[PDB]
Structure 1
Amino acid sequence: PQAAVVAIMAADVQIAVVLDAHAPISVMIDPLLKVVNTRLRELGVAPLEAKGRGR
């Protein structure tokens, strides 16, 4: 199937990833967040957080 390579950016960092191009974003956001948090924690960078309520 088609999967798109893209860059992603957060937390003053940019990472490149390959995303399952035809799956809903709601399928992928949660493990993408976990991936980013693991990568940032590996870099010694303060990981992402939810502040109060939001999404």
Structure 2
Amino acid sequence: PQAVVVGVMAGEGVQIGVLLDANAPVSVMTDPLL
């Protein structure tokens, strides 16, 4: 339950599978994710 795998869409259409932290707040992840 500590993490969840999800697909993230990026510029012009590339889908990438990522394993994200399930409890940190989303604003903490958007910078390193970019």
TM-score tier, shorter chain, comes to 0.7 to 0.9
Which structure 2 segments of 5+ residues have no match? none
TM-score calculated relative to the size of structure 1: 0.55
C-alpha RMSD over aligned residues: 1.1
Q: Percent of aligned positions with the same letter in both sequences?
A: 70
Alignment coverage as a number of residue pairs: 33
For normalisation by structure 2, the TM-score amounts to 0.83
Return the structure number with greater strand share. Answer: 2
Moved over 4 A (4+): none
Larger Rg: 1
**Unmatched runs of 5 consecutive residues or more in structure 1:** 34-55
Q: Which has the higher contact order (CA 8 A, sep 6+)?
A: 2
